[model samples]
Target chain A: VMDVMNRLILAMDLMNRDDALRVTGEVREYIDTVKIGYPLVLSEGMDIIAEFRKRFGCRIIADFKVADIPETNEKICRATFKAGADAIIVHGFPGADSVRACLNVAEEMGREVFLLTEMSHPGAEMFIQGAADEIARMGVDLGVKNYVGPSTRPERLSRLREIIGQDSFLISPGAGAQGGDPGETLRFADAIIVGRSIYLADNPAAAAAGIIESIKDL
Target chain B: MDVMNRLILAMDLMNRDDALRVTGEVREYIDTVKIGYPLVLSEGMDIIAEFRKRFGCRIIADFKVADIPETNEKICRATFKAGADAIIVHGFPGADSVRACLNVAEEMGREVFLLTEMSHPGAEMFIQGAADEIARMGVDLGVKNYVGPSTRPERLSRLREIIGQDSFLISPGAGAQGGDPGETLRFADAIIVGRSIYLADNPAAAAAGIIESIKDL
Candidate 1:
């Protein structure tokens, strides 16, 4: 079984279905999961998830970062899972209740939940640094098994890995274009999520395979 | 001119037709339509286009954009191209993400409302703690709009002071969420109202009542 710990995931942040489908077709064998972010979700809706699943036969992760009320968060999570996502990324900023609301639904549905403790942006520290640790601890307490740590900042990822321990998983984005070295990120992260580096490449298959090849030696 | 002084209706409905119908009824009472994630997710950008065609008013895409700068810019452009006049962004991604979205807004002649503090119960744990720093960053970026908490007046008041009185503040969570509409206005320039108006027996009248409630101020 190709689990998160041994896969290179494609972040499908394209503007249209044609671009998305083309990239998926080229890179399907090199990647294990397809991450549907805001641009694709807002531009194409959940039908994109269904479309991706049918074409690629890979795990689908909806990068919603659920932050609304408990009721609204649950509704969005349930809708995303029903649309064919194998897992969904949620924000830890909304605290434990909002995180647990989605977790409860994920638990019932048997879908995975990836809690975001820190982001990949430079300015992330100014906001999330204060609460990232506590939030990560809260997720661990609730039995969450996966987390999103920034690959751009490997030191922070290592710190988060230490806090969350070795049993859990970490999915780090920001490789290639955003500034994270895939080789270094893989030291702590269970999987590295790359978007523009792969989809926007001249040959997405080569781009993805190159990443896998580079990291396989580790 | 249905300006920003009046209540900004939150068209957080699930489908496009219902959202269109309610916006048509309340067009005279509100100035802007706040299209949230749920509605956008259900109907896609077509919902935005439909709302823009029918209302001919300002549309705020409450997207809460939080991604890398490259991805953030694409989402912002796509949103504005879809027909929104303004959009809301999350502060979690910090100054870099906020500035990237603002750049798209600047180039397109649209506006970006920074989510300083949210109006939900869960918002307290994270947003409030970072509100001060985010506000400073917004001011430095020349941001003139913000989404302050309707649930917490003190936080809204603090944000108002931080962003300055010249900048606009839009508050959400007034009716069904238990925040007092009239009280939210003491600091907010406009309230992002939803359920109270849309779920009422007479949505138009409900919207009018909210506008009348804030008129005296």
Candidate 2:
């Protein structure tokens, strides 16, 4: 339902626009959805979303990690969605109301909210991992259909899948530079998010092709 | 010491002109202003530099940073690179995430204000349960500045106790959120006032009145 081509999302963290566009253009055959975070957005501008869309004819997911009170959260969601993101990533740590504010705005704009239940880094083990199950359950209770889990831990990713069940769409990051195996991660996640591995490679198009080729049988 | 008059204006206004005008009007009372996403995301990070140049204000980027440590580092660098005096980071993401911001703050010679508990109604669900432990974690990680909610004075007092006397504390939810400015100062080194002043018919008068009430402190 998320409509990711080849089950690969280009976690384009690169801040430079020309290089980002060039690399993304190369990998376009392997990816239809690109995850754009603050590094790129803050570095270039929000208009870059539409530019990426216009060029590639692909979907843009803004990994904003939106965390704030409902009032400020509402404004952030509106601004981000208006700037042309198909969906925006929001943190669940701030609790239901904050997530709901974003969900409401996404609903108003006919967009999506990908609730980030857990992160893919070792630091996420401390509080986020402990709270992740409950956060995912909270998302379920609140009618969240899209979620992000850690590809670095397939067991944890599987646990999230069990929590959200079969229907809800799930994505995972931590492949490549973060040490997650793309094929292994796909067993639990609907899609695998890759960044430094492809973007930083000498041949980004070849790098993406290799990743996709490796995961093709899965 | 970074905040004057024990008051840090929470400039939540999204528009540049209104934000600048109100901060200028209350300039006599406030020297530090908390600029969060409502302003920054709308205006961009350069607004921090603009606020500093125009009002001579110490800017706190209330980013409520909650992310993986890797991304946290990049966010902090980008924030400090914009000239924020301090960046507020959430303590809930555990040590590594908070540490990432602390590292960036230290590297940049800026400060990181650890937000352990928030002032909003929704905080009770998850954040309140983790706040005290989060405060403890902040101390464990060598964080010196913190934020708590003025809405619940008892919780604020508990946060202050958790952080101990030496660490600097600031509290939000004052005024428009039913937190009394004078009372919040007992627990917080500085009180963050937003809607009550920024949304006022007379912004300067509102700030002056709050300062007048808390002057004895």
Candidate 3:
């Protein structure tokens, strides 16, 4: 149900509160959605999600790779949604019950959950990459709507796209600092999640615009 | 290595007042607490320092961290900076992610507990299949501490064999989760208990009883 307009989502992962908010505010024109992970939330507070929404008018995706038991998973999701997250990212590799816990809470609160199928890091291949397809299938079998894949590898990203089908929404991270091209990632992902390249840029808005401009024809 | 009484409290209580109160009650029986996201997210990371200052217990941030290596490193650094003595991370995400936590932990003079397999039923779906290999990965990476399921003694024994006797092993899922404290102690150095104690009529007595049962070990 989320429309990631401008085909971009900023991974506002900077740990400092001021730096995170400032960078997101800078890139507000290019992206109206931000992925708030543990780095910022643990450093600042969970209230940062609501703060981001009120200040930037952005849809905040809590990038908490929630991996825990079923009971704990439910509590984590409930608290996350209560904090004003438009959506929360969950790891599907923990299996159906864990994923179901998040899905159940998302349904109750009218929030969304984006299942992380595969990661875009070199270490991810050691375990997650092997189970990427099955994890994606678990998402499909469980009726997941949104997903996360690695932008660094378009082939695996493409494979994820095929598994989740065209209708399901996909977001790819690992662009910029992780060496994924925005244009290439956008080929399969509905939106590309960019962090360091834009957030750490001297002029974030310009950095964001440059990426969007490069992918404009796509 | 200093989980007094061979028991660690799984402090899953969300509210700070209730969590602190229950933990303070059992403080005499235990010197280590496993703080998961449920508590930390509800209160704040400051709660970690609160536990240390008040109860003088070691905090193992049971984050069950699963993320890309870069983000994993950031999480570890932030967690350690918040005064956690150790942070629990998942091994199923592979070596780089696990190493990210290990690297920061090493630099910060903290520890990263590699969680090879979880205690819950859902863990059977994917984590169980990968548990042994994940344990092997932990061994290959020179992980000193590990977490395994208390509910399955056979699997726990297998994990013990893999990591060998030198590595510190802690098991959760005991008591209320249907794991016997004495049985789990057969392989695990310490047993993690949550609802059975925290939600009991007498948390301190509850802790005492479990300690009594396993004291002979």
Candidate 4:
């Protein structure tokens, strides 16, 4: 039901277009979805999402973590989806109204919404953890089937998986430079969102292939 | 001492012409421009440089960066290099990332405003309670500038106490979002105002009136 074919998502957090294209192009065969976050999304415009689509023919997930009022949330979500993102991730911190506003666009346009229940960062625990359950439950009730989980913390991931249920999907971050073990993380995570470990490597293709190989059995 | 002149105009526009037009009209009233993510993403740092050149004001790039420390450092560095006087970072990533951003700001001689709490209505569900603890961590990490417990009057006062007197506070959600300058200014040093001024019938007069109204309080 989630419609993903691969376990690895190329987190293209690169500074510019060339670096982003080069690394993503190298790992094209190994991945079916490409994630574009703040750095690239800000450096280049949403056009980058279109460009990635043209080059790789892969699904583009805009990791915007949208957090604003209901009106602004809908506009931003609509714009990202129009720019060619197959799905968009939004922050749950903005509350139910804002999340529902974004989901309104996703529902109308037939795009997916991945609620950020918890993040890969340590500070996420300070605030995001306390609200993760409530956020996930809200998202589930709103007809959302996907959520962003933290690969860095297994206990949190387990807790989140239980809240969202086995049918809903979890895309994990923190696999590479953030020190998350893919083997352990893959046990609970439906897919992994990796960045620096692959993009910053001398051979991005080989790096992606290595990670892909490890998750082959899973 | 904080280097900013207190009043920050939120240039939350979409294109260059609209951004330039509003800033030009309101330039005489405010001393700093708060550039949100849409404008920065649409125009890049060129827009930031343009605002600095035209208004001769401090530029607060509201990037709301929430990523790994390495990624955050790169984004913060690029933001300053593009001409932002200060950058806003989300506290959700925890201390390590916040510290990395502060390091970038220090190395560049710019500023980093840690987002302790937001002004949006929904922020109460997740960000409200954690704001006090986040404010504490920010002080421990050497951050002197904070974005708020938002414009919720009481939370602003609470965070003001948590962050201490020597630090700076930039409150958003004023005007169009249901916050009053008189109530917010009691705790905030500078307020980040957006739609109420920029989208008004007479932006210049509106901005000046808002600034004048708050300056008296």
Best by lDDT: 3
The window of 10 residues in a row where model 4 chain A has the poorest summed lDDT is A1-10
Candidate number of the best TM-score: 3
CA displacement after TM-score superposition, residue B130 of candidate 1 (Å): 1.8
DockQ, ranked from best to worst: 3, 2, 1, 4
lDDT of 1: 0.83
Which 10 consecutive residues of model 2 chain A have the lowest summed lDDT? A38-47
Model 3 chain A, poorest ten-residue lDDT window? Answer: A121-130
**Model no. 3, DockQ:** 0.81
Clashing pairs in 2: none
* Candidate 2 structure lDDT: 0.89
Error of 3 at B111 (Å): 0.6
lDDT of 4 by residue, A106-182 (tens): 99999999988888877776667788888888888877788988999988898889988999988999998988988
Candidate 3, residue A118: CA error in Å?
Answer: 1.1
Task: Categorize the docking of model 2.
Answer: medium
Provide the DockQ value for model 2: 0.67
iRMSD for every model? 1.8, 1.4, 1.0, 2.3
The TM-scores, one per candidate, come to 0.94, 0.97, 0.98, 0.92
Q: Provide the overall lDDT of each model, using Cα atoms, as 2-decimal numbers.
A: 0.83, 0.89, 0.91, 0.82
Error of 2 at B116 (Å): 0.7
